[PDB]
Design a binder for this molecule. Sequence first.
Ligand SMILES: [Mg+2]
Ligand SMILES: [Mg+2]
Ligand SMILES: [Mg+2]
Ligand SMILES: [Mg+2]
Ligand SMILES: [Mg+2]
Ligand SMILES: [Mg+2]
Ligand SMILES: [Mg+2]
Ligand SMILES: [Mg+2]
Ligand SMILES: [Mg+2]
Ligand SMILES: [Mg+2]
Ligand SMILES: [Mg+2]
Ligand SMILES: [Mg+2]
Ligand SMILES: [Mg+2]
Ligand SMILES: [Mg+2]
Ligand SMILES: [Mg+2]
Ligand SMILES: [Mg+2]
Ligand SMILES: [Mg+2]
Ligand SMILES: [Mg+2]
Ligand SMILES: [Mg+2]
Ligand SMILES: [Mg+2]
Ligand SMILES: [Mg+2]
Ligand SMILES: [Mg+2]
Ligand SMILES: [Mg+2]
Ligand SMILES: [Mg+2]
Ligand SMILES: [Mg+2]
Ligand SMILES: [Mg+2]
Lengths: 172, 222, 159, 58, 185, 51
Amino acid sequence: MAHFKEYQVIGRRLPTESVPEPKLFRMRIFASNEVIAKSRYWYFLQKLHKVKKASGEIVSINQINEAHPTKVKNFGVWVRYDSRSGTHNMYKEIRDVSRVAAVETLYQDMAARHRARFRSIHILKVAEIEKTADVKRQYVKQFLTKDLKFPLPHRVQKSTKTFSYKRPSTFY
Amino acid sequence: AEQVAAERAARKAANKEKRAIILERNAAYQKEYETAERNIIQAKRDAKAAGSYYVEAQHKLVFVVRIKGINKIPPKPRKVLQLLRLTRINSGTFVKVTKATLELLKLIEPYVAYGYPSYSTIRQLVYKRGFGKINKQRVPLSDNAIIEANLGKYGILSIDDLIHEIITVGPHFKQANNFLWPFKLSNPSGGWGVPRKFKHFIQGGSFGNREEFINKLVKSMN
Amino acid sequence: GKSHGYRSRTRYMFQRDFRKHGAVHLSTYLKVYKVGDIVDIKANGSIQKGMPHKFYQGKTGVVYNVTKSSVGVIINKMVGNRYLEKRLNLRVEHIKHSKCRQEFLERVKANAAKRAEAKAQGVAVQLKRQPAQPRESRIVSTEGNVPQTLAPVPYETFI
Amino acid sequence: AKSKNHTAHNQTRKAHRNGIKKPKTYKYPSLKGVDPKFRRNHKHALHGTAKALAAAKK
Amino acid sequence: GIDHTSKQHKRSGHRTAPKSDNVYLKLLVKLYTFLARRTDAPFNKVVLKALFLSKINRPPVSVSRIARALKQEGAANKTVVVVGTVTDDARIFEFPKTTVAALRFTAGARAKIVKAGGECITLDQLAVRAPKGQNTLILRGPRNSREAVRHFGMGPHKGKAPRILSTGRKFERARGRRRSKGFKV
Amino acid sequence: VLKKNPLKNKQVLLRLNPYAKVFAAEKLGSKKAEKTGTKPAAVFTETLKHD
RNA sequence: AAGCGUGUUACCUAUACUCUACCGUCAGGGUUGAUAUGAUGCCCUGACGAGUAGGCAGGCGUGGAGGUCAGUGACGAAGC
RNA sequence: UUAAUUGAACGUGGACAUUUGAAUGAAGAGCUUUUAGUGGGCCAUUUUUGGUAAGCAGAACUGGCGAUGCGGGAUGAACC
RNA sequence: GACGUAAGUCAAGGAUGCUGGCAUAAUGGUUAUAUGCCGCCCGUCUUGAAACACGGACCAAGGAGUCUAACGUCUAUGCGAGUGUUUGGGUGUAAAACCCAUACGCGUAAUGAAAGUGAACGUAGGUUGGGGCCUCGCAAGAGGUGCACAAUCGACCGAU
RNA sequence: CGUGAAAUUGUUGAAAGGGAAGGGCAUUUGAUCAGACAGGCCAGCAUCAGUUUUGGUGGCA
Ligand SMILES: [Mg+2]
Ligand SMILES: [Mg+2]
Ligand SMILES: [Mg+2]
Ligand SMILES: [Mg+2]
Ligand SMILES: [Mg+2]
Ligand SMILES: [Mg+2]
Ligand SMILES: [Mg+2]
Ligand SMILES: [Mg+2]
Ligand SMILES: [Mg+2]
Ligand SMILES: [Mg+2]
Ligand SMILES: [Mg+2]
Ligand SMILES: [Mg+2]
Ligand SMILES: [Mg+2]
Ligand SMILES: [Mg+2]
Ligand SMILES: [Mg+2]
Ligand SMILES: [Mg+2]
Ligand SMILES: [Mg+2]
Ligand SMILES: [Mg+2]
Ligand SMILES: [Mg+2]
Ligand SMILES: [Mg+2]
Ligand SMILES: [Mg+2]
Ligand SMILES: [Mg+2]
Ligand SMILES: [Mg+2]
Ligand SMILES: [Mg+2]
Ligand SMILES: [Mg+2]
Ligand SMILES: [Mg+2]
């Protein structure tokens, strides 16, 4: 997962003589490549419709890119995941510029704060908050205040040498 | 003075004629590869322009590589690995996709990496690591007469005739594929890309169907 | 101690089916068996005479002998590291014709019918069966069939 | 002292080192077990079949 | 490591030479090795393999067995070839005039064949006059009529000969061999 | 006596495959495609950016 | 963090994989009108090589015996 | 055997061939004789019995160790 | 195979060309030591041994599947419906070698408890294969003959 | 009192030695040693062949 990529996977049941042209079901999948993408698609169609990969078909695999990959936007994401003793829904918020990179941050956040692996997480919905004050988290709301400005105290400079002759400072 | 000159010159007269026939087969194979790829590309474009989706034909050929050693293998998958001629680690064969052969691939699934080989990967594989089964011996191809003397009864007269039979799964794929000795690949030159090989490709390991990334993986071994 | 009688461990194997008890219907009494017929074995608990052993339930054999009320069946039994030939005298109640042979004989006629018309025209009639091939290319129209599906649903309890 | 009473462990690896094999069917199987009345008459039918072919072919 | 389907380094299980140290039989092997390699005649390959055979593997061939093979239609003028010993048979009173090639003739067999007007030759005279084995007739003697074969595969209900020193009553004609004494095999 | 590898050793590459000389000269490994500008229907694009 | 969870690469190294050489084994072969005179020889080709109990094969060594080297030796045999 | 060439079984003569009746592989296929050692087992995953349990006692399939070194688990018969 | 119109050349069925130093302890071998990393004591019984299991302080010499009667399989050799000279006899350069009559053993007949009887209807049978050989075919193949062997149905001998 | 082994020991010489010694791969050092001038020893460079590894860069889809 160098980056996540968002794909649409459109699939359908296999046509029969009695019911040709099935319903063409489509999902949006976050995966590292098109193999995991198609795999995750069938995993979720199991949860909804009476179909598996043998009795079904993948009609379209299209990668989706950001309409504007370079504007910082507030993302609201709903995640259903598995804890060690139950299943839990939660809604989080990530400030970033793309859906795929917020999902990258979100999977790092679940695994860091809840020890939930990619195996246990169900991305319910990734929705950009359209206008300010519908952002409900203080760790994102603190980044929307006007004329925001902060320093970076205690700069640590990585030397390329083992021995230095100056007793380096941490100013910035 | 013993008709040596006449049998000398007439052998190259035969050689030029067989070289000319092969040259005009490799020109016709090059055209149909280009014609087929462009027609598929326009198939996706013209279905997109008509509000439809172009469902690609399911792949008719895999290149299966045994990525697991020979110790501690259950009997039924072990017997299938012998029937697919994968007797050691990093060995590879082509398989023609049918529901009969698709069930072999499910049973050897934890032990092999497989997917769909491109023309480029088939060409480099046969040209570099291509060997014939000539009277139970393993003979490097290295010459069109080596292929002609063994597969000529199916029309396969040169190394591209053989490659054409592999990528386009023809009426004589089985005879042309059993003729090829199982490929003895190396370990991948950059590595496997994963810390642990013995998970599925989907889980982040190496085995299973990795449909189109087998081309990148096999070329590192080749 | 241990019990290993003839009809041991046959509690449900030799039971009649639910609401299929009573006298045997006359079709098994009118079936004609011939030497070479392929037959399946399924013991009828109602008929205790002429009755197979529990090993031969579900085994398929070949008729070698035809008797008054009974049939002789060749069956191969895996004993040790090889197969042995077993001759059984089974009454016709525990015998039905094997449907595997009946279906293959249809393809023997159909192959002849396809090959009779072969010499009129069309060499290479493709008489061998083939496995299921991979699907061919097709175009899927969205006319009345626009793709739409939701995401995974959230967790509820339903209790 | 006590010991292991029974195990079929290794008994399939032993049975497969020499290849469990079908009993090699022949043409004309043995007529053992065939009905005596049929076999008694089949002997007399085979005699006249050869006798008819003796006169015809010579 | 290789998942070996078959035993490695397995020998063919066939003789590539006679175990005999006969210097003259080695010349016959040397001549037919050349003949079986520089000709495509199947006869030269069959004879070469038969020259490796052990003593029980080339049973004696009677002149009566030779003569019966000459009652086949068109086989009268063929050269009978026996890779082994031709013995004599007094039970047969007429012998045809034919050419026989053998490794060995007994004195009675050579007398009977010659007295009939025929000829006895060695396998190298056969090679000179029939280099491809044209118009030949390979005859082999009965292998399983050996007394040792009677005891091969001994077991219950198999009807084989027991390995026994003294025969007669009191020697294995009791319990196990008749229903009046226990059981019958 | 020694397996000389094609995909290098151009001489062996020409012993096999006589078309390798035509392919090299005509630059068929870098062939230009034809500029056609068909565009997807409205249904495809609206399905792509659909949530 | 040099801890915990998760992601990406780079890197290290088995008697394992690829290539080559050498040894042996097995298998398939070539080779006689000079086999450039050793056909149990010479040579070509391919694959293979773990091992207790155990089986077989080819060899090394010791005492004595038949043959041979018209063998070695008080100008130094054997032994150490 | 049938009321009866009606059958049953075995046949004579005629027609049919590499897509000859699925896939894959085939390492040569089949057969025989003779004899060695062994007939204390144990461990891992999954199923499973008795038992609170056991580095316990007893079974099923498979893979191992025994019989086996090599790299890793610091170290270890069986784990990777 | 490639190039060259050809001549010929070439990176095309496995390293050649040019130059320098030394010509001996320089390289190499052996051995001692040092250094890096590794290395538990062998033999035995055992599921399991470095074991807090057993034998072993050391060294030399000695030290354990032999021979015989009868026999099974296989192999070599001689002869072959026979075969075995060596119990004996003859002979001798004298325990050797060489030569030999009648017997006898095994084989050439089986079966039954026995008294007894005792092996071709046939091209020593029929059918399915069967190597090799013959005929026709450029060959593939087809037909004929088919030893050994394999399966099966018969015929014959003895017992019942 | 022929020869006169080994265990074990004395002298001399060499070498190493902070709670054993011994051994395997490699090399340094010391000591010791075989062979060869009608090419033996160790190398440098160029152009190739085979197997790889690491870059720079070009044209396409
Ligand atoms: Mg690397
Ligand atoms: Mg019971
Ligand atoms: Mg009763
Ligand atoms: Mg026991
Ligand atoms: Mg970490
Ligand atoms: Mg070994
Ligand atoms: Mg051993
Ligand atoms: Mg001696
Ligand atoms: Mg001396
Ligand atoms: Mg014991
Ligand atoms: Mg043990
Ligand atoms: Mg540990
Ligand atoms: Mg370890
Ligand atoms: Mg595992
Ligand atoms: Mg030194
Ligand atoms: Mg040291
Ligand atoms: Mg250590
Ligand atoms: Mg113990
Ligand atoms: Mg020990
Ligand atoms: Mg003790
Ligand atoms: Mg002691
Ligand atoms: Mg001693
Ligand atoms: Mg003295
Ligand atoms: Mg001393
Ligand atoms: Mg101290
Ligand atoms: Mg180079």
